């Protein structure tokens, strides 16, 4: 029963390092590669190396080389992969990936769930919530000026989900994050019934409720 | 039976395009990658290319991405490259070669063609054929050398032999050597005894095919 | 080094669709490669190794072909679930990505604007949000225009996943003004170009 | 493109010794798939190329046991244990790691022999070639070893450069020496000036330079 389990996410400063880990389990640690991969948001996948769990040795991607490191604990069959000297580029899920077979194999069969890891200049912020005035009509709300990622977004406290989106949060130029979220409704419940944002931001502990009206 | 064949030679005009032919066994063509490499005369040996020939899956050295082009003939077995733009400096030998296939080759270029010459001219000129003689103070009773001075010709190459092949032994025919004239010249001596110069008869015979020139020359004091 | 080219870079298919992409690994004599698919959020997937080969797991409609350096992996009678994008590898290598997504009819845009709270003047910014709502293609335009000021650089899109139900897409370009850039000024517009549009539409409100 | 450095260009070696060849790739040549595509080729005078040795050190079908190569990474050696007249030849490396695939320079094999010095000849110009107006003077050394001769044309005491143009044999496959030309190319204006014509040869073999020589007419 083959199991790779990496660290929680990260959030970093330009210059600094990260460690993330990777525990093996199911299989005998010393007998396959472990490599590194990772994936900036909404791009492609970007090997970064392996390293050989029963000698230590590696390969580093050329990208890489110089600021990245690849260890092993055989003991408690944990890769560690550290990526120094950080930069905004390397904002990106890392994921630990494992051979299907021994020695020099490619086909990563075997995958952690992924570690997030935040590079930004940015300080830990809440975000600022704006309602989304109606001119089927459209009610939502404005998360504005927000970092690190994620926050959430509900309407009514679950009461409200059909047509509703929460877009993708963008980043600005400011190094902060910003979305919307919005809902179509009917025209009849615009003066019955009220709409209220559950918007919340766990890292900065920022529960707040923005209430829509015309 | 062999693996790979390829033509003898070809003559080609600068500017022009000449396309090369190998021809592969069944055996070769399912299973082998096929490469092309040049070798100038007395240079050393350089990759061009090769070509799956199940899938015209092609690989070049970025120098002759333009130059090369790789295909092959399914029915035929045949695998091609054509030159483009020709030049002086694509006078070569290019050999064909196999590679095995699989997650990547595991042995090498485990065979190989005999290669095809490729002469790139501008012009044909045939050579003049001087005698080189032993003087008057020769040492008798010793041993002589005489030659042939085989000037001012264009392309190479010349073949030159001595009494119809009949001489060999001790035959040296020297390297071509380009002069500023932009023509080869070259020598082509063989050491006797000194009392044979009165009596044997010596003949250079010159053959310079590509202006299809037989010459031959005799040699006396 | 090795340069994998996968094509096409995004696919339309519908549900039941027989789906081929592909695959070509050039300045490389390897001929095995490996494909794998992601869905948001979750690591890749292995479909196929060695070329051909079928991962554990994976149905009988996923196959993978290999002659030389091309590759094909073929999926027969496409699934809903099978909507993703998918990846070719050679040793380090992976290819840009093909992104298989779900076609359907043509659906316009139900367009939307909303001027800044005044909550968010208090502040001391300005952000004028407009939507394009349950829409498809995903291909679309949006303009913003300033009093009849066709404005540029500083507004900022954001497209949201195709719809698992009904299939469409909805966009949020925010146009982010200064207070003072904003209050001095009249009349500003939201103007939006689709496929299922006859001619643009326009949505606008004076401040 | 990787890079590969062969060491020497030429390899003088007697028969019986060790040969030894060494190759460097610019960068790691070890694969991804864990293998180090290595080969060495030999190319012998007139023949196509023949695979010698794979994947660093293992001999292809029928290279006999005298042929050994040795490496890691970047750095390979070539060894021939007990050289024979037929490993004549030029020796290259190659590394197939790399797309594209690269061949080293190409280290000559020359089979060292006792000293032996030239026999030197000069020929004057044809009589028929004085007409179409140029004059060759041919200096023929026939049949030495080593390849290191010094050539020089006297044209009535009078030393000359950029007069002349040498040629020189590949090393005999049998009795492994060299022989080399020197002609001296000249107008007949310029030939029929000067009267004596030498050329004077520099080699270990001779005890001092020989002088060859004649007058013209
Ligand atoms: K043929
Ligand atoms: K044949
Ligand atoms: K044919």
């Known amino acids: 029963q083959v199991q790779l389990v990496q660290s929680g996410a990260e959030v970093k400063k330009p210059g600094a390092s990260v460690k993330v880990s990777c525990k093996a389990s199911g299989y005998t640690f010393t007998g396959y590669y472990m490599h590194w991969v990772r994936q900036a948001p909404g791009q492609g996948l970007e090997w970064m190396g392996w390293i050989n769990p029963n000698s230590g040795g590696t390969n580093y991607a050329q990208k890489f080389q110089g600021r990245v490191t690849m260890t092993r604990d055989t003991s408690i069959s944990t890769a560690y992969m550290e990526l120094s000297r950080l930069r905004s580029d390397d904002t990106a899920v890392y994921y630990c990936a494992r051979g299907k077979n021994c020695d020099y194999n490619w086909d990563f069969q075997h995958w952690g769930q992924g570690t997030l890891v935040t590079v930004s200049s940015a300080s830990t912020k809440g975000p600022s919530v704006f309602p989304l005035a109606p001119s089927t009509a459209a009610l939502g709300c404005l998360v504005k000026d927000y970092f690190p990622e994620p926050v959430t977004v509900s309407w009514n406290s679950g009461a409200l989900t059909s047509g509703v989106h929460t877009f993708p949060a963008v980043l600005q130029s400011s190094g902060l994050y910003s979305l919307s979220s919005v809902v179509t409704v009917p025209s009849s419940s615009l003066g019955t019934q009220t709409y209220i944002c559950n918007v919340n931001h766990k890292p900065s502990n920022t529960k707040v409720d923005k209430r829509v009206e015309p | 039976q062999v693996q790979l064949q390829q033509p003898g030679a070809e003559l080609v005009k600068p500017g022009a395009s000449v396309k090369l032919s190998c021809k592969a066994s069944?055996?070769?063509?399912?299973?082998?990658?096929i490469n092309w490499v040049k070798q100038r005369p007395g240079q050393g040996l350089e990759w061009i290319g090769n070509?799956?020939?199940?899938?015209?899956?092609?690989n070049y050295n970025e120098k002759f991405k333009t130059k090369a082009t790789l295909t092959v003939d399914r029915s035929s077995r045949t695998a091609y490259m054509q030159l483009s733009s020709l030049t002086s400096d694509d006078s070569a030998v290019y050999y064909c070669?196999?590679?095995?296939?699989?997650?990547?080759?595991?042995?090498?270029?485990?065979?190989w063609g005999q290669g095809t010459s490729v002469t790139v001219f501008n012009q044909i000129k045939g050579p003049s054929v001087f005698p080189l003689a032993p003087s008057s103070k020769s040492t008798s009773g010793g041993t002589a050398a005489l030659g042939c001075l085989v000037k001012d010709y264009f392309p190479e190459p010349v073949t030159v032999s001595w009494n119809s092949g009949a001489l060999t032994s001790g035959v040296h025919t020297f390297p071509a050597v380009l002069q500023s004239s932009g023509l080869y010249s070259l020598s082509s001596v063989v050491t006797v005894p000194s009392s044979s110069l009165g009596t044997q008869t010596y003949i250079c015979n010159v053959n310079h095919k590509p202006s299809n020139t037989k010459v031959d020359k005799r040699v006396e004091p | 080094?090795?340069?994998?080219?996968?094509?096409?870079?995004?696919?339309?298919?519908?549900?039941?669709?027989?789906?081929?992409?592909?695959?070509?690994?050039?300045?490389?004599?390897?001929?095995?490669?490996?494909?794998?698919?992601?869905?948001?959020?979750?690591?890749?997937?292995?479909?196929?190794?060695?070329?051909?080969?079928?991962?554990?797991?994976?149905?009988?409609?996923?196959?993978?072909?290999?002659?030389?350096?091309?590759?094909?992996?073929?999926?027969?009678?496409?699934?809903?679930?099978?909507?993703?994008?998918?990846?070719?590898?050679?040793?380090?290598?992976?290819?840009?990505?093909?992104?298989?997504?779900?076609?359907?009819?043509?659906?316009?845009?139900?367009?939307?604007?909303?001027?800044?709270?005044?909550?968010?003047?208090?502040?001391?910014?300005?952000?004028?949000?407009?939507?394009?709502?349950?829409?498809?293609?995903?291909?679309?335009?949006?303009?913003?225009?300033?009093?009849?000021?066709?404005?540029?650089?500083?507004?900022?899109?954001?497209?949201?996943?195709?719809?698992?139900?009904?299939?469409?897409?909805?966009?949020?370009?925010?146009?982010?003004?200064?207070?003072?850039?904003?209050?001095?000024?009249?009349?500003?517009?939201?103007?939006?170009?689709?496929?299922?549009?006859?001619?643009?539409?326009?949505?606008?409100?004076?401040? | 493109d990787v890079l590969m450095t062969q060491t020497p260009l030429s390899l003088p070696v007697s028969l019986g010794d060790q040969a030894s060849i060494s190759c460097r790739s610019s960068?790691?040549?070890?694969?991804?798939?864990?293998?180090?595509?290595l080969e060495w080729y030999l190319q012998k005078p007139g023949q196509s190329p023949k695979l010698l040795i794979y994947?660093?050190?293992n001999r292809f079908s029928g290279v006999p046991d005298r042929f050994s190569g040795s490496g890691s990474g970047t750095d390979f050696t070539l060894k021939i244990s007990r050289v024979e007249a037929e490993d004549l030849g030029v020796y290259y490396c190659?590394?197939?790691?790399?797309?594209?695939?690269?061949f080293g320079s190409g280290t000559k094999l020359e089979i060292k022999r006792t000293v032996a010095a030239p026999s030197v000849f000069i020929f004057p110009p044809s009589d028929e070639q004085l007409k179409s107006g140029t004059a060759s003077v041919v200096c023929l050394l026939n049949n030495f070893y080593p390849r290191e001769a010094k050539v020089q044309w006297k044209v009535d005491n009078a030393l000359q450069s950029g007069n002349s143009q040498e040629s020189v044999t590949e090393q005999d496959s049998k009795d492994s020496t060299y022989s080399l030309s020197s002609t001296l190319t000249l107008s007949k204006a310029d030939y029929e000036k000067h009267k004596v014509y030498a050329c004077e040869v520099t080699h270990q073999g001779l005890s001092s330079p020989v002088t060859k020589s004649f007058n013209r007419g």
């Open positions: 070669a196999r590679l095995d296939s699989g997650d990547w080759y595991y042995y090498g270029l485990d065979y």
């Open positions: 069944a055996y070769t063509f399912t299973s082998y990658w």
């Open positions: 070509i799956y020939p199940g899938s015209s899956s092609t």
């Open positions: 960068q790691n040549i070890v694969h991804y798939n864990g293998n180090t595509y």
């Open positions: 994947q660093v050190s």
């Open positions: 190659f590394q197939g790691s790399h797309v594209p695939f690269t």
